[PDB]
């Protein structure tokens, strides 16, 4: 939205199963969220976890 | 841990012209700090 805060992420999550295209990441607020590299566009925060 | 405290309690949901002149004092320090390096290197 119009509302940015920036939260330290302090868990990564990685899998092969999963592949490069996903990575997980834990917020310090409490929620997760999910970042997808593209070619075409640098990051894209796909999912947001338990908002 | 003051400037770091300020940032947690944004989280948890006249002081500006000082706060403003903390990103030159950031700047002035790196600068001061490598004469001072190559100042004691040759001393």
């Known amino acids: 939205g119009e509302n940015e805060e920036i939260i330290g992420g302090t868990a990564l999550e990685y899998n092969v199963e999963a592949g490069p295209s996903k990575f997980l990441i834990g917020t310090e607020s409490g929620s997760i969220l999910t970042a997808n590299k593209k070619l075409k566009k640098p990051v894209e925060i796909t999912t947001r976890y338990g908002l | ?43």
């Open chain 2, 1 to 43: 841990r003051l400037l770091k405290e300020v940032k947690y309690f944004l989280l948890l949901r006249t002081a500006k012209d000082i706060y403003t002149k903390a990103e030159t004092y950031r700047t002035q320090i790196v600068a001061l700090d490598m004469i001072v390096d190559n100042y004691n290197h040759i001393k």
